[PDB]
């Protein structure tokens, strides 16, 4: 601006937000995780079990056969191709997403690995170790190992290098964001899975009815090398009213809880004083030592390393160890399976002992009421698994299976004397199917709901679905609640209203998920700067040292934590340590935790430093920076590039996660909180908090909301539940989900005729493209009690406005059909069947089909019309209802249009599937015009259906002649307290009168009084009231009507897709009761609650008729001797018989529901005899 | 997708003013409020018709025709 060092304002923060979204986008987490997995994780997985060795020993049978062979298969580098598809005839070509969607193909690339096949041989002289030598056979080629589905708009996809024009050529929408997969032609989004972080000690309290009072648990996890989890639990047995409370730890593969002292001695610390020194780090904390004395007393009889190890070993579940391999067995368990996340190599007992003491110390601190039990809902202890890690574990499992198959083939080839064919040893189908099956379904194996069909109802729906997270609900916590740690990380308003309330979360706009990096460089850096190793740490000679943790591993201690943290922070800010790395300094606890693992959710914040030039703390970002941010923003529409990364590398913004958020002070705004320190009565009361130690500042408070809540105008003037309702409902509004809807064949699609952009908009909406792809219209809304047809959440719509096109939409439905081949003999074809050669032809009309069995686009269709004609051949010697003559050789397998739907055929495409069979897609157009059953909503939870429609001359009018497009009841306002609805109408009224876009972002300086002054400047009543006239008589209404524009949305629920009645119709095969489903002419359920109500009414005969004549009614014949339905009745011959009873004259007929007959027969199958009798044997 | 022919509320013809509206915005450097009044749109029902319209047909025209003559 003027000075490149002047402080910025709250308006300049939106330039920073704009830069953030220019660099990242809205689906950054999906693309970033996949790119990391494909780039780095795939190579790592194959470099874990790359070597497979098959040793053929001497097999001493004769001295002419004394050589021992060793065959080795090793995997080298892995290569990935571009997406491709192989046809039935064996031709492979590049596949683009548009063709994959239309042809039901999977968008995937191929994986290749370099394989080295070595063979050594050695002379097996008896009773000697061998010297294997390479026998001059080292073959070294690329081997196909399967196909990897490719996420769209990723590094390996064809659309990452495409410009806007290129996307248009490829029939792709520029507004499309990617982040999903195409499996069998279906768009699938991977929902992030929420889990609890590993390698963190957590201390919990147990209820009264349990011998254990406290338990410190750590789910040890190693991110690289084996992926298996082993849990260690340290339990404090006994209650507070006991005379002896000891501590016992659970080790893997030991079957029993060992006293902690025994474990310490097994690690090499025999002196009791040293053990206590490892647990308690203060020599005068006698209260903690007093609680430790019982432990050292329990394990007194063991006083050396070997006896302790044998004590551990005999508890182990191996029973192959005899008595002498049993000490080593315990030693190996303590080395490779005890606390694996520190290390698994020989010679690190000191680290294990110190960490075990650390866990015990935390357990005792909580047991002594010095610490509170760890909060399970703390969002900083949670991890979100994205597509990257999810595909990583799936691939790890599948590659293990592939390698196992490879060796089994090697062994089988060596024994059964066959030739080795590398084409059969490696089955590429293993990788291809496992990834396809897991992505087609949600079943992550060989967890559910991990993959869902991406919503494409509207643009906002797609964006929200691509940023959802899930939490699988025995647990002791309240995970459904909105925790404090959720601030600025997940939207506080967007959650389902059903059983998923609080379990399905949505990321905030500026939220991000880390991909994780290598912790080794940081550990090496710490070692060079004075992080004294943990092998020489004497707690009693340094009772001020800070413990240094890296990914939950206690690596050492530091004498000057302050300088180390300063050096670490400066390195991260200038760009030597990855910004995703989280650094926390718990000054009181004397701990320094560094986190580098993947799955931590973080968000950016401004950095606040002293800058003594002004004498008070201020943001590092100045107006000079903001000037160049916007200069680069507008030069695109050439100064040096200056992006979000430049802010990050210059130390002006900082990524912060929930755990690091515990040690910082944040200012809501730089306007008032940063400056050292009449008022407008209309402005809200803002609390200063008068703190002079701020370390960071919010970019803007509005970014705490998600995609769905960022469309709400003035969400801070609404009751919170209304914001939640709108977040859910905004995903059901018709709009323009994509600009290429005329080249896509979706199952269903709704397109608004004339989408408008809201008069009252939000600044966050600038990045959601709601102005380019809006979902709704600006209707002139009056809040009045006009005719009583808007009572109880209904509305009156203007028929004249409907006639002109208000809220009118297109509806598209696609029908799919294939030419199946039932083996080698029976095959189908698309045909126009004739009534003389085809059986079971539908009662509809085939007049619109062509010779290929398809209706040409542009033809109008209606109910029962056949749009895809198909026939299949039949087997002879099967006659149904007569009507089956030698002329008939085909049967109808046609596809009719939906019974209730009609329209015009819009598009017909014919192509071939992966297997080369012909299949077609037919799309039908129809226009939906608002009627008296359609649902409409505003952006404030106010939804309703049209009660009635009126023409313009019947509606209430103003002196200017303006009539409402929509009338809602005043009674909808008070109880719901949706004040934002009324503020939006006032703002939109001013916006239309002045020709501007109203600013409705939540936390701003805009007040109702300011809008009122603007409205009065335009010659209108300041509060939005107008004098209206009755349309029937023309007289003034005694009251004045709140009247102005409001953004309404047409929802997905239309009555014409719900109305359905049934007199009689098809029945189910099993129970012979009305079928389920409106689409199948089904009936309605007269359930148990309805039965109870009719019992309360005393309508016995009506209850019987509903259950008998309106549903299954069946007549059976029962025997008078045995009450079984075993009577063979020849009703034509008037003969009855119950063989077994040898009677023909004691038969009765009863009327029971067919389900009752089914029930009794099922009981008969279970050897139960329900005998129905027509007379009583006992008195009441 | 394309400009509505009539105002929804009152039915005044507004589909013959889109190009005039755009030309006023571009070449005359007028603010949208002044342009709306210069076109004769006085009632705010008509102003929001032209002020909130999104021209999607321009996006649809970027795709090559399905069937060329």
């Amino acid at each position: 601006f003027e000075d490149e060092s002047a402080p910025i304002t709250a308006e300049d923060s939106w330039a920073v937000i704009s830069a953030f979204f220019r660099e990242k986008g809205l689906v950054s987490q999906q693309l970033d995780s996949f790119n990391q997995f494909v780039d780095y994780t795939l190579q790592d997985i194959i470099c874990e079990d790359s070597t497979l060795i098959l040793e053929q020993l001497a097999q001493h049978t004769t001295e002419s056969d004394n050589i021992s062979r060793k065959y080795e298969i090793s995997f080298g580098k892995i290569y990935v191709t571009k997406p491709m598809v192989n046809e039935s005839d064996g031709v492979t070509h590049a596949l683009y997403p548009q063709e994959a969607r239309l042809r039901n193909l999977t968008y995937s690339s191929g994986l290749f690995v370099d394989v080295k096949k070595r063979t050594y041989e050695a002379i097996d002289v008896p009773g000697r170790e061998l010297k294997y030598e390479l026998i001059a056979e080292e073959s070294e080629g690329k081997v196909f190992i399967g196909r990897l589905p490719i996420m769209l708009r990723s590094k390996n996809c064809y659309l990452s290098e495409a410009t806007e024009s290129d996307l248009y050529k490829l029939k792709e929408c520029p507004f499309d964001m990617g982040g999903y997969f195409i499996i069998n032609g279906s768009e699938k989004v991977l929902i992030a899975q929420e889990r609890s972080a590993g390698n963190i000690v957590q201390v919990f309290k147990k209820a009264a009815p349990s011998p254990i009072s406290h338990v410190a648990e750590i789910r040890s996890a190693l991110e690289k090398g084996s992926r298996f989890i082993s849990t260690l639990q340290v339990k404090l047995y006994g209650r507070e009213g006991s005379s002896a409370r000891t501590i016992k730890a659970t080790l893997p593969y030991i079957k029993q809880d060992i006293p902690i002292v025994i474990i310490f001695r097994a690690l090499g610390i025999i002196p009791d004083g040293e053990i206590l020194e490892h647990i308690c780090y203060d020599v005068n904390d006698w209260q903690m030592l007093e609680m430790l004395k019982p432990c050292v007393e329990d394990g007194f009889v063991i006083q050396d390393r070997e006896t302790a190890l044998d004590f551990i070993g005999r508890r182990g579940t191996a029973l192959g160890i005899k008595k002498e391999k049993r000490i080593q067995y315990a030693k190996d368990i303590l080395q490779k399976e005890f606390l694996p996340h520190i290390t698994q190599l020989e010679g690190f007992e000191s680290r294990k002992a110190f960490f075990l003491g650390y866990m015990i110390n935390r357990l005792l601190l909580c047991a002594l009421d010095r610490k509170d039990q760890d909060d399970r809902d703390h969002f900083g202890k949670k991890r979100l698994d994205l597509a990257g890690p999810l595909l990583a574990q799936l691939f790890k499992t599948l590659f293990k299976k592939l390698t196992k198959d490879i060796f089994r083939y090697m062994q089988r080839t060596v024994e059964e004397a066959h030739d080795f064919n590398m084409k059969l040893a490696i089955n590429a189908k293993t990788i291809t199917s496992g990834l396809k099956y897991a992505l087609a379904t949600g079943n992550w194996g060989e967890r559910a709901g991990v993959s869902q069909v991406l919503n494409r109802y509207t643009y906002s729906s797609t964006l929200s679905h691509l940023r959802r997270t899930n939490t699988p609900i025995g647990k002791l916590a309240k995970p459904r609640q909105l925790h404090n740690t959720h601030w600025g990380l997940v939207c506080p308003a967007e959650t389902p209203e059903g059983q998923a309330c609080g379990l399905v979360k949505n990321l905030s706009l500026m939220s991000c998920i880390s991909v994780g990096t290598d912790p080794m460089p940081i550990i090496t850096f710490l070692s060079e700067w004075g992080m004294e190793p943990l092998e020489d740490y004497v707690p009693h000679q340094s009772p001020d040292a800070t413990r240094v943790f890296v990914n939950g591993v206690w690596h050492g201690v530091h004498r000057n934590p302050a300088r180390l943290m300063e050096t670490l922070r400066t390195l991260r800010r200038k760009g030597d340590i990855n910004p995703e790395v989280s650094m926390i300094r718990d000054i009181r606890e004397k701990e320094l935790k560094i986190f580098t693992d993947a799955g931590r959710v973080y968000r950016p914040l401004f950095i606040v430093e002293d800058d003594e030039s002004l004498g008070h703390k201020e943001l590092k970002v100045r107006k000079g920076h903001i000037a160049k941010l916007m200069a680069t923003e507008y030069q695109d529409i050439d100064v040096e590039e200056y992006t979000w990364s430049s802010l990050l590398n210059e130390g002006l913004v900082e990524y912060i996660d929930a755990e690091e958020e515990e040690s910082i002070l944040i200012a809501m705004q730089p306007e008032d909180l940063e400056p050292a320190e009449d008022v407008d009565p209309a402005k809200r009361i803002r609390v200063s908090h008068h703190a002079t130690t701020f370390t960071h500042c919010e970019i803007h408070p509005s970014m705490i909301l998600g995609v769905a809540a960022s469309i709400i105008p003035f969400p801070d003037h609404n009751q919170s539940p209304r914001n939640t309702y709108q977040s859910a409902m905004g995903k059901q509004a018709m709009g323009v989900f994509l600009t290429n809807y005329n080249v896509r064949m979706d199952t269903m699609a709704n397109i608004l005729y004339y989408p408008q952009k809201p008069l009252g908009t939000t600044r966050a909406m600038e990045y959601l493209k709601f102005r380019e792809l809006p979902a709704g219209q600006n209707a002139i809304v009056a809040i009045a009690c006009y005719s009583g047809y808007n009572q109880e959440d209904s509305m009156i719509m203007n028929q004249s406005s409907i006639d002109r096109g208000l809220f009118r939409s297109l509806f598209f439905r696609s029908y799919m059909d294939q030419e199946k081949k039932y083996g080698m003999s029976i095959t189908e074809t698309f045909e126009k069947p004739q009534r003389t050669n085809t059986l079971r032809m539908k009662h509809g009309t085939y007049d619109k089909l062509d010779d290929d069995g398809l209706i040409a686009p542009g033809v109008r269709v209606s109910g029962e019309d056949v749009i895809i004609g198909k026939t299949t051949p039949i087997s002879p010697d099967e006659e149904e209802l007569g009507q089956r003559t030698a002329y008939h050789s085909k049967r109808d397998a046609s596809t009719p249009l939906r019974s209730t739907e009609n329209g015009i055929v819009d598009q017909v495409l014919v192509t071939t599937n992966q297997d080369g069979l012909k299949f077609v897609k037919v799309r039908v157009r129809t226009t939906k015009i608002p009627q008296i059953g359609d649902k409409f909503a505003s952006r404030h939870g106010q939804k309703g259906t049209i009660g009635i429609t009126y023409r313009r001359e019947d509606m209430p009018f103003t002196a200017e002649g303006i009539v409402p497009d929509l009338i809602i009841n005043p009674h909808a306002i008070p109880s719901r307290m949706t004040v934002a609805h009324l503020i939006e109408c006032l703002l939109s009224k001013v916006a239309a009168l002045s020709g501007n876009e109203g600013d409705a972002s939540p936390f701003t300086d805009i007040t109702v009084e300011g809008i009122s002054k603007l409205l009065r400047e335009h010659g209108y009543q300041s509060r939005g009231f107008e004098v209206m006239y009755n349309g029937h008589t023309g007289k003034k209404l005694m009251a004045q009507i709140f009247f102005g524009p409001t953004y309404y949305q047409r929802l997905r629920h239309m009555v014409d897709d719900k109305i359905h009645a049934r007199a009689r119709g098809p029945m189910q095969v099993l129970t012979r009761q009305p079928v389920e489903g409106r689409s199948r002419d089904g009936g309605l359920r007269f359930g148990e609650m309805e039965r109870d109500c009719m019992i309360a009414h005393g309508a016995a005969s009506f209850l019987k008729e509903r259950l008998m004549e309106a549903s299954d009614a069946f007549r059976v014949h029962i025997c008078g001797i045995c009450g079984l339905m075993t009577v063979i009745a020849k009703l034509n011959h008037n003969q009855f018989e119950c063989k077994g009873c040898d009677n023909k004259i004691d038969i009765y007929q009863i009327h029971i529901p067919y389900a009752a007959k089914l029930l009794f027969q099922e009981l008969m199958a279970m050897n139960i005899t329900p005998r129905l009798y027509t007379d009583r044997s006992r008195d009441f | 997708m394309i400009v509505p022919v009539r105002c929804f509320s009152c039915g005044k013809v507004v589909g013959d003013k889109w190009e005039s509206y755009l030309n006023l915005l571009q070449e005359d450097e007028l603010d949208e409020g002044t342009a709306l009044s210069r076109l004769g749109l006085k009632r705010y029902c008509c102003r929001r018709m032209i002020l909130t319209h999104v021209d999607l047909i321009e996006k649809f025209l970027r795709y090559n025709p399905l069937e060329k003559r």
């Binding site: 916007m630 200069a631 507008y634 529409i637 407008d680 209309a682 402005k683 908009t761 600044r763 600038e766 703002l987 001013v990 916006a991 002045s994 501007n996 876009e997 109203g998 600013d999 701003t1004 300086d1005 805009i1006 007040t1007 009084e1009 300011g1010 809008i1011 603007l1014 | 915005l25 603010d31 949208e32």
Partner: peptide, 19 residues
């Protein structure tokens, strides 16, 4: 007491002009 309008159409022109 504030400008309740998102001014985008010509504020880009103002900044582009200022430079």
């Amino acid at each position: 007491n504030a400008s309740p309008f998102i001014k985008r159409d010509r504020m880009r022109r103002n900044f582009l002009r200022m430079r």
